[PDB]
Structure 1
Amino acid sequence: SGEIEFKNVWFSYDKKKPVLKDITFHIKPGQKVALVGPTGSGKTTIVNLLMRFYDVDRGQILVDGIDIRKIKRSSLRSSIGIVLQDTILFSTTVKENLKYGNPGATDEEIKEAAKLTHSDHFIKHLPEGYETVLTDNGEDLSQGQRQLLAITRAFLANPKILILDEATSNVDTKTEKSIQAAMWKLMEGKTSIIIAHRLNTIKNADLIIVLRDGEIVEMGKHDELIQKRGFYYELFTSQYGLVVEKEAALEVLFQ
């Protein structure tokens, strides 16, 4: 479970000038894949097609050997889990938010998962704990904490495919290490597609897919790509020695 294949995929929203051109790659079950490339390189569109917000104009996409066009839509969506950088939540208790993705779970199973994903602690400090109402869709919580809940939520849902933003950096250091431990736990034994901009996650990915102008221009592990002086090398060194501000991430991979 979690196998993903794009075979000669072409796509355009306009049906005028293509956005994606001959996208071809294969992901083995349980791999961690970094999609890297500047804004508008095709990252978003690849993920939009995998979630089947649109069908491809040419080629095909397979999830575990089956064309996604032939998969029941509710079964495709519930087998894919997304965590964004700026998560939106529902205006109920913390417990109820977590219980999306697994409504049938017991109250203890919720706490176990929240424990396994390092969000239990901050939840307990909320004025009413797991019963705390998250008014205005999580307004009171910090961006990191909302991301924490989404991770625990997705952990409960146990999808076979994860589509992930990197952890937010506009967080306290304690919460960041917390989020990263939580994401590692979430990714365990699952196929993970990461819209990557952190050096560390790009360096440790099982596979890097480098996109430029809607095409794959390099594909492989960091050690392979870094010894040729192509586009990846340019992205990786674009910040080298430059002072500011968030040294962990390549700024050109989201701006």
Structure 2
Amino acid sequence: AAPVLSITNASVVYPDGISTVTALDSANVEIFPGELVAIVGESGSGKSTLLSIAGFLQEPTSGTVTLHGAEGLDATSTRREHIGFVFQQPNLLGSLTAREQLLITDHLRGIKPRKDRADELLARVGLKGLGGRRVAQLSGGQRQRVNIARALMGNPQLLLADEPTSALDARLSKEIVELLRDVTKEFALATLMVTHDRSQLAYADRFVEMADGKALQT
């Protein structure tokens, strides 16, 4: 079984005026289909930085990231067709309704929006009947799950979830990570999921713990 994603010896270095900050240092990550790999570590250890290059949001300053079955494609087309993002902040577009937050991903991927697909995914994250809400009429956790539902709207092979339960109560956060692994298993997805709720490791096949930008021995 070939990996879906290979992060081979990757680093990110930002300039801090005179000095420089090494957000990520020599990351080596490889994930295969049907795997859900959790990512643990303290605030500021590099968890989102790892997903940012995993998701082709930026090229690494050293080393390479390869999504196979998408080599020979630019970063943008790779994200559009093969990756789903659950950003740390909800990142909802201001003028759309919850339902349309999902529909627009169909639009940018060049297919006619499927209206029924969206209310099902909205129902799955516990938001039935809230499809008409605007971002202002949604709570911090409700926004987060609109964020979540939007990531499952396409047919990616790589799912990147960045603390997707931060704004969720104990009961709902557990259903979200059951949701995430279930789709991981059903569609042979490669999923990385950052979380501070270490109880959730039970739903992960492996996990990477991180400190000061480095992955540690596990």
TM-score bucket (shorter structure):
0.7 to 0.9
Aligned equivalent of 1:252? none
Aligned equivalent of 1:164? 161
2:202 and 2:171 map into 1 onto residues whose CA distance is 23
How many equivalent pairs are there?
A: 206
Equivalent of residue 114 in structure 2, options 106, 114, 128: 106
Aligned equivalent of 1:87? 90
Letter in 1 for 2:13: S
Aligned equivalent of 2:27? 23
Structure 2 stretches lacking a partner, 5+ long: none
Matches within 5 A, 1:1-255: 3-14=4-15, 16=20, 18-64=22-68, 71-78=73-80, 79-90=82-93, 91-103=95-107, 104-115=112-123, 117-119=124-126, 122-124=127-129, 126=130, 130=131, 132-134=132-134, 138-168=135-165, 170-171=167-168, 175-176=172-173, 178-188=175-185, 189=187, 190-219=189-218
**Which structure has greater strand proportion?**
2
Deviation at 1:99, TM superposition (A): 0.4
Alpha carbons 2:164, 2:195 under 8 Å: kept: no
Higher relative contact order (CA 8 A, sep 6+): 2
Alpha carbons 1:80, 1:163 under 8 Å: kept: yes
Deviation at 1:86, TM superposition (A): 3.6
**TM-score, scaled relative to structure 2:** 0.78
1:202 and 1:7 map into 2 onto residues whose CA distance is 24
1:38 and 1:178 map into 2 onto residues whose CA distance is 24
Identical amino acids, percent of aligned pairs? 26
> Structure 1 pair 212/75, CA: closer, same or farther in 2 (3 Å)?
same
Post-superposition CA distance 1:10-30 (Å, at most 9, x none): 331228464333222211122
Post-superposition CA distance 1:183-206 (Å, at most 9, x none): 344444321111121223223321
RMSD of aligned residue pairs (Cα, Å): 2.9
Structure 1 stretches lacking a partner, 5+ long: 220-255
1:208 and 1:175 map into 2 onto residues whose CA distance is 22
Alpha carbons 1:89, 1:97 under 8 Å: kept: yes
Q: Which has the larger radius of gyration?
A: 1
